Amino acid sequence: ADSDINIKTGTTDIGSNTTVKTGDLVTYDKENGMHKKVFYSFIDDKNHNKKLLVIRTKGTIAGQYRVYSEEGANKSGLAWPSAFKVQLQLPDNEVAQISDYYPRNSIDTKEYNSTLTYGFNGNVTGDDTGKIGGLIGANVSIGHTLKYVQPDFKTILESPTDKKVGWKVIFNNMVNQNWGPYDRDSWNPVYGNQLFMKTRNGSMKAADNFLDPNKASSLLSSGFSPDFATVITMDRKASKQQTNIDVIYERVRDDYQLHWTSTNWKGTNTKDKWTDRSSERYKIDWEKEEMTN
Amino acid sequence: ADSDINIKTGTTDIGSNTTVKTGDLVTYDKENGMHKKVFYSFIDDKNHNKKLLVIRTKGTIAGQYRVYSEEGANKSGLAWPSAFKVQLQLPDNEVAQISDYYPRNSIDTKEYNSTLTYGFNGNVTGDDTGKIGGLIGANVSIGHTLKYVQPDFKTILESPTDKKVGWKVIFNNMVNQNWGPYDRDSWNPVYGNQLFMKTRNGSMKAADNFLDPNKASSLLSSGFSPDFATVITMDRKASKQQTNIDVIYERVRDDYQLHWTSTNWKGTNTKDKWTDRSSERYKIDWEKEEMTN
Amino acid sequence: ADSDINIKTGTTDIGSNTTVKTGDLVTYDKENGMHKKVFYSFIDDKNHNKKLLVIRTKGTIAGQYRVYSEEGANKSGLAWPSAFKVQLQLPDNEVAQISDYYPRNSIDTKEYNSTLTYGFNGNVTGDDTGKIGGLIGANVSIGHTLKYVQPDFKTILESPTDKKVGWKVIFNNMVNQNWGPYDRDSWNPVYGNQLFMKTRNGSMKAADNFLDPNKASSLLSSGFSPDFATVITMDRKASKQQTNIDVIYERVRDDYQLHWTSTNWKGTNTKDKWTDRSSERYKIDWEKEEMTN
Amino acid sequence: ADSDINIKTGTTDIGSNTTVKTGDLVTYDKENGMHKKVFYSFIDDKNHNKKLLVIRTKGTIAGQYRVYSEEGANKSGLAWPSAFKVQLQLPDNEVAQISDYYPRNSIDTKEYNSTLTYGFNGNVTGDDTGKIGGLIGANVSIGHTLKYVQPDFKTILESPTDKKVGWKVIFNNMVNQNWGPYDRDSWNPVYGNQLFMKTRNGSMKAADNFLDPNKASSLLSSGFSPDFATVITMDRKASKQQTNIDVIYERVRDDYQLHWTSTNWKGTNTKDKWTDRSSERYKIDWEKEEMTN
Amino acid sequence: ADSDINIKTGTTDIGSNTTVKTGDLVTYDKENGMHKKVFYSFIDDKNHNKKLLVIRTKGTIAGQYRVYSEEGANKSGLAWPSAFKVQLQLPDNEVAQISDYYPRNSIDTKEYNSTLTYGFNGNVTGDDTGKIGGLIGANVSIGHTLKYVQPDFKTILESPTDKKVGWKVIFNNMVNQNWGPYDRDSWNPVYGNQLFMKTRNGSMKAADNFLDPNKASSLLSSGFSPDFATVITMDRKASKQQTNIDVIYERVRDDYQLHWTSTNWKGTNTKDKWTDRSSERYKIDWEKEEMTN
Amino acid sequence: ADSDINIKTGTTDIGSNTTVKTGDLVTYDKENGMHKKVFYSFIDDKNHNKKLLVIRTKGTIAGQYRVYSEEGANKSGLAWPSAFKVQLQLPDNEVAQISDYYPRNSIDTKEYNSTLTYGFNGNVTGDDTGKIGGLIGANVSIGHTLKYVQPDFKTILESPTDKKVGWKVIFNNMVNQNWGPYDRDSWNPVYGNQLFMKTRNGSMKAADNFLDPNKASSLLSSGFSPDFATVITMDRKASKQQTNIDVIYERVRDDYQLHWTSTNWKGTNTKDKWTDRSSERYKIDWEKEEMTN
Ligand SMILES: OC[C@H]1O[C@@H]2O[C@H]3[C@H](O)[C@@H](O)[C@@H](O[C@H]4[C@H](O)[C@@H](O)[C@@H](O[C@H]5[C@H](O)[C@@H](O)[C@@H](O[C@H]6[C@H](O)[C@@H](O)[C@@H](O[C@H]7[C@H](O)[C@@H](O)[C@@H](O[C@H]8[C@H](O)[C@@H](O)[C@@H](O[C@H]1[C@H](O)[C@H]2O)O[C@@H]8CO)O[C@@H]7CO)O[C@@H]6CO)O[C@@H]5CO)O[C@@H]4CO)O[C@@H]3CO
């Protein structure tokens, strides 16, 4: 931080004494169930070597967790969001560049606990007949406990370039009615993957044996609201002061199936079964400082 | 945050050098027990590409946790709030759009603790006769603890569009006199769902064997106070500068019933038995910058 | 801090009453998969004995965790990032100096828990044949629990001089599907190093038995985004007011090999097998207060 | 705090309505591997009874943790930093005085847990022959658990006078691959001091059996970056308005030796074997309000 | 807090619209190893009923933990700081008064954990000879855990008057190499007081069996830095506008003696064997707003 | 909070654009060992319906923990502060009123931990003779833990009226050398009340068997510093613009006595044995805006 290097806070930040032009662009993709919103800001700071555009991709991608197929009371399928994605990309011959973005990938940590114990204990025994007994024994215990936090979904910054940047919020793991956690690869020789299995031996129809969406991650059903920012820089002398940028909102769905084995329920999960992609092109005009779609 | 992208804090925010028109609108629905209040704010920032309206839905929906039926003395039913809802909807022909909203769904997390342990120990017997014994043993343990928070109610942002947005505060689970927690599906073969059961074997009538509201989540009785914000954008060039919007407050009630088996109490819960819907039409005038109902 | 020595906050900071000249310079290295971005700030504060240039090295170095080789189906290798580095170097004939930098090395801590516990107990047994027999016993135990946090990667400031400075974010240790944590030297006689081993006895081919990137540190694949700052001072009277500086972005990759032993999977790790070095020269003009490349 | 004594916050602080003159002085000692940087600030506040100079000593002292000796494959020695020092000294004739400094020594704390627990347990036995048995026993136990944090290195303000002040960052203790923690006096009859011992009885050479620096405190190798402030005051009537002051950066290295005993590795540590002392004289001109070396 | 009584924050503080006169006075007492610094501030706020002088007593009192006594290879003495004191005193004739001071005494707390646990447990036996066994027992446990923090030294505000005020930072207790903690009265029938004992029975001179100062509170050695504030009020109409005040920095040292008992080390601690007192008279001129010594 | 009700923060606070008159009044009662200080602030905000006076009662009441009687080595009594009090009272005929005060009584809380655990365990014995048996058992355990903080002294706001308000800082309970905690009612059939007993069976003068004041709450000896505020309102039309108000500082002391039984020490505590009351009248002049005594 500036203070660590003996500099007045904010001194090197950009935007002071600059008339900032902002804008909101909302698009709703009915078929893909995605509310796409771009909030932009043109920052042409004259003490900065380039014009800047801050593009904030927000809105929300519906989870769309749902029973899609019910082919018999013994077999049913559930489609669910295993990944949400937002991507911005500048066409190959664009002189403008991707300069920054937030959030980014943070280093995860884990707490380690190592414990060593050992003790002693005696024991004088006896009975009515008169037998006087005794005992002496030692003991040693060594063990460790590993602690770490696991978000239901991971927010990851995809390897960016000067033309493209993106984030993917992927299903990590989840607790099912206090059990697990389970993930996309969880497997029980008897029950298979119990990720969204409501009951193991219940008697209802397969289509009714899936976990209640309210008892699972809210992102699965109601959806995820992106809140990403990317800064694009542009040379004032660049010959073409108009830039095109394509934005992808995406949802990757897995297929979780339940079938009755005549004795109990067994679940299966198939990865990236479906993919819903909504693309939108925005036009950036660095002279009028406006962004449209 | 702006700091992470080397930009002066608040540089890209909307509002500066703008006269903002605010307003308050209160409506009490007696039949539905809802105090409905709209706090609005027009922000027509000329450096922003569109007119903006921030609508904050507040007030409070009474819980109405009450004993409604009493078929005799050994059976009675309790009406309780399993969900509170607030929705705003723009008629499909409006050019104005829902651009943002808050709160949104946040990713839940859980803490995982893995523990491994190994031990050694010796034992040396004894007794008056002069018999000396021995003992050498080992042990291994591989247990793990899972930790997470469980709010009595979850605040969920429903999948929005550019015309409709809503929230639902749904009952999640609750503690009943230190036991449980219990939820809408809890089931014991003997006592059924004990969600709001005061006693297991009391000799009182059914109507008097429901948990005292003061010992349950206060939202169940006194109520929930929404505090949601919806942002609506409007083209300044739009021919029609008036917009209609409907705001709906709802309460979904479950039916928790108790009956005497002959030896103990047994409860059952019927989901979404009743639904109290309170809708209201508001007029938004982007030119006068006022909202009326 | 200033307040700790009775001095008004901010009093000794640099930057006040100074027009700061900032700039952004972006470079993408396709071959090495590195998005390199320099954010600089020239601070020529006249109450300071020197001109300053704050150089923030950001961008993102792709992790590139991937299977690079596979011989048959029982042998395969995985290239992964064990180190990410950023270095700045001023030529020996330069009069400009490296004055500060951030972050720096933090002093690690650990928590200690010492446990001592005494205990005694009485006992009395008996049978139908009226046999009375008591038991008196005692016990002690010394325990020690050690606690500390372990980041997946450590961020380290390398020993700087007045002409060179660098940082290295190195792989420390990582949790593999709840087990471990494992590091570059972990070794088990039967399984070898299980760092990125998916299964111990799986029947799939080697290339398919590597931990899924989504289930490992996000730096390994998507990558690491540097956020380091370098401060360079320049004498206003130096004959030469132009400085060249070389910035280097690197990725050191280890080679994690898996092979079937006819009975189970066994892995090995080879350190620093590959090094991707991306260097670029920038020109610093202290007079025009601009940096170019 | 000032609010505790009903005084407007910052009212007694120094620096308002004063032009502060600052400066940076960087020196790199190659022989001792020390990047030395002085950041000074002259505050001649006229409502203060004396002139003020704040000298911040920063830069970085390399750790220099390295294998220095190799006599065969059974013996080897490691040089490592047990202390990093920074000292400032005014020659005794100077009228100027050291008035303040930061950081200082803080009172350390510890947590105490007393656990008294009572216990009662009975029993009933009955073999398949009609024989009955009983058991009644009690138990008591008093446990104590001590908790406190131990930084790898302690940052200490040495006893100052009005002519000299200094800090010493000394090696405290450190975890070795989850064991320990070990310190400079750690001793085991078998392995001796295992402080930096990689393996107890590995087959490699002595020079290859030292802990990976990356697995040890980063200060040991990469180095320590001082961040100390010294405040010096000066009478305005002082006849002589120039002051000399020496600044010494120091590193004390221990000698850690490992030798093969023919059955297992044994470690030995020799304290303060080497001292690297880098001294430099600066000139303080209270009139020109500048510092020079 | 002002906001708690509906008053704008700071509305009540003293000092606004007032030119404050500050000063620094440094005195080094070599024989007593005390860096004594007074930082004062005169606040003559015309809207306040009296003149204010805020005296801050800082600097640092050297710890001086040392093996000063050596009476052969079986006897040695360590002199250590059991208390540090700072006192300010106005003569009985003075009209100026002590009005406020900081820090003050804070109410300590303790955490209480009351645990009650009980349980049952079945058990069936059976040898390959047809003999079946049974077992049924229960248990009850009642135990409490007391938790609290123990600073090495306690900072205490002595009972002030309108003429004198003072502080004392007294040794509380301390952890000795993972054991204890020990205080000034710790007594063991075999080892006596092990406060600063390094080994129970190591074979070395008595002068070498004392705890390394680096392994004990740094206040014992390097020293304590007072940071106490005293506010003295003066009536603007008082005949004499000059006040004398005596400031005393003091150190009380205990004597920790070690001696071999033919088999082990035994320790004793003598309280307040030495009291190092450093007093200095200062002159306060309320008309000139100057403090001198 | 103002923000919670959509109002600009601080918008409703009192004191803006108002000249505030403040003052200090110091009184030392040697007989009662009480430093009494009043810090007042007249706030006559013309946009507020009444004149306002903020009276801050501070200073400090000496604890006075002391051995007062010694009737032979087997008997001795200790006087200690079981309560400290501060009260302000306006004679009944005053039109001025006590409007607010701080601190107030806050709702205490506790943490509840209910643990449910059940398990199974198999076994198989054996003897070189050829016998092969086994033991199968189960177990259950319901245990709960209660957590809460217990300050040594409780700061309580006494029931106020519009003519009188007061606080009491009463002794709650205290840890005695890691045992207890003890309070005024603690009673042991063998030792009686051990609140301040140094040793249970110590062979020394009774007057020397009281706990060292440094090992007990510092309020007991050095004392408590009141830091209370009282706001008084006054009608501007009131015909009499002078108000009298008495401030009482008080200390209540218990009597803790230790007598040798013959085999051990036994303590006894007599509640509210003594009461030291220091009263003083102040004159409030709402026109001159000053407080005098
Ligand atoms: O009996 C003394 C103890 O009693 C009280 O504790 C009760 C507690 O307040 C209740 O909430 C409940 O606890 C349950 C807990 O809430 C559950 O989460 C679970 O616990 C698991 C842990 O979550 C999990 O991480 C792992 O735990 C391991 C630790 O992570 C690891 O650090 C180590 O623990 C050692 C401690 O580090 C060390 O300090 C020392 O602990 C002593 C305490 O510091 C001391 O205060 C006192 O504890 C009181 C406690 O304060 C009361 O509130 O004595 C302790 C001595 O043991 O030693 C620890 C042991 O080595 O190891 C642990 C175990 O591997 O696993 C656990 C489950 O095993 O379950 C809990 C039910 O036990 O009940 C407790 C007890 O009544």
UniProtKB/Swiss-Prot annotation, chains A, B, C, D, E, F:
Among the record's GO biological process terms, what is one? cytolysis in another organism
- The main location is secreted
Keywords for the protein's UniProt record, in alphabetical order: Cytolysis, Hemolysis, Secreted, Signal, Toxin, Virulence
The answer to whether keyword rRNA-binding applies is no
User: Can you provide one Gene Ontology molecular function annotated for this UniProt record?
Assistant: toxin activity
Per the record, its GO cellular-component terms are: extracellular region
Where does the record say this protein resides?
Secreted
Record-annotated membrane-spanning stretches: none
Q: What is the effect of changing residue 144 to L?
A: 16% of normal hemolytic activity
What mutagenesis or variant effect is reported for residue 35 to L?
No hemolytic activity, reduced oligomerization, not toxic in mice, no effect on ADAM10 binding
InterPro entries documented for this protein: Aerolysin/haemolysin_CS, Bi-component_toxin_staph, Leukocidin/Hemolysin_toxin, Leukocidin/porin_MspA_sf
- Effect annotated for changing residue 259 to L: 46% of normal hemolytic activity, slowly toxic in mice
SUPFAM superfamilies recorded = Leukocidin-like
Q: What is the effect of changing residue 48 to L?
A: 7% of normal hemolytic activity, reduced toxicity in mice
Comment text on domains:
The mushroom-shaped heptamer is composed of a cap domain (comprising 7 beta sandwiches and the amino latches of each protomer), 7 rim regions whose protruding strands may interact with the membrane bilayer, and the stem domain (52 Angstroms in length, 26 Angstroms in diameter) which forms the transmembrane pore.
Self-association or partners: how does it assemble? Self-assembles to first form a non-lytic oligomeric intermediate, and then, a mushroom-shaped homoheptamer structure of 100 Angstroms in length and up to 100 Angstroms in diameter. Interacts with human ADAM10; this interaction is required for toxin pore formation, disruption of focal adhesions, and hly-mediated cytotoxicity.
Q: Which family does it belong to?
A: Belongs to the aerolysin family.
> In UniProt terms, what function does this protein have?
Alpha-toxin binds to the membrane of eukaryotic cells (particularly red blood cells, RBC) forming pores, resulting in hemolysis, with the release of low-molecular weight molecules leading to eventual osmotic RBC lysis. Human RBCs bind much less alpha-toxin than do rabbit RBCs. Heptamer oligomerization and pore formation is required for lytic activity.
In Swiss-Prot or TrEMBL terms, this protein is called: Alpha-hemolysin
Record organism: Staphylococcus aureus
